[PDB]
Design a binder for these strands. Structure first.
Length: 201
DNA sequence: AACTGCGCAGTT
DNA sequence: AACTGCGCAGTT
């Protein structure tokens, strides 16, 4: 199958693919966590992440976007620490990891990060799909740093620039590779009838 | 001075 | 709940 600490693209899953649920995304091996937004080890790096909404500063510009770390409680109580996934995402960036933040002198060498976009990010991003989840290729960490929210507590911000050959599925060439490849929304088996039987009664 | 086990806890 | 890092703890 596909090792869990596997960085990079999943063979058999092209960009522009769309599963209706997160469970399907995990099943596919593109983002294992059934609910969490990022997957990775403190000692290895981040393998994948999905976009929901959260922070209001998080700008999604398509080819690049910024992300916010997690933790700070157990509701903001303590300023986030560079441990766990916060740290793991920090490794994908190609520079010696540092407490005050860091910017890669050459971001392209950093470890790849599979990025999926959920439709819950529609309000904010004009790139999030209408419904479900869509795989938009590889993004590498360019730089990360720590800000201080309106809650006076530091939070870890990151900037991801795309870097996958295959064209963004929201562009002309993208929407083309899709058709050629015939990619369509995917529902779990038995889901559509289950959904049907809901509406009835 | 440490091996080790029951245990609170943050992260996902 | 599962899994981890490991105080504080009673055992070696």
């Amino acid at each position: 199958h596909m090792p869990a600490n596997h960085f990079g693209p999943i063979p058999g899953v092209p960009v522009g693919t769309m599963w209706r649920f997160r469970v399907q995304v995990s099943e596919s091996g593109v983002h294992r966590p059934h609910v969490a937004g990022i997957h990775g080890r403190s000692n290895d790096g981040a393998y994948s992440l999905v976009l929901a909404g959260g922070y209001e500063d998080d700008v999604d510009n398509g080819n690049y976007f910024t992300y916010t770390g997690s933790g700070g409680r157990d509701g903001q109580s303590s300023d986030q620490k560079l441990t766990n996934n916060n740290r793991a995402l920090a490794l994908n960036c190609h520079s010696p990891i540092n407490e005050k933040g860091a910017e890669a002198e050459d971001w392209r060498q950093g470890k790849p990060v599979r990025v999926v976009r959920n439709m819950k990010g529609g309000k904010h991003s004009k790139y999030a799909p209408a419904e479900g989840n869509r795989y938009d290729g590889i993004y590498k960490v360019v730089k990360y740093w720590p800000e201080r929210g309106k809650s006076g507590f530091l939070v870890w911000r990151y900037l991801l620039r795309r870097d996958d050959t295959e064209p963004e599925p929201w562009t002309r060439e993208g929407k083309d590779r899709t058709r050629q490849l015939g990619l369509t929304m995917q529902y779990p088996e038995g889901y559509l009838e289950a959904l049907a039987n809901k509406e009835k009664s």
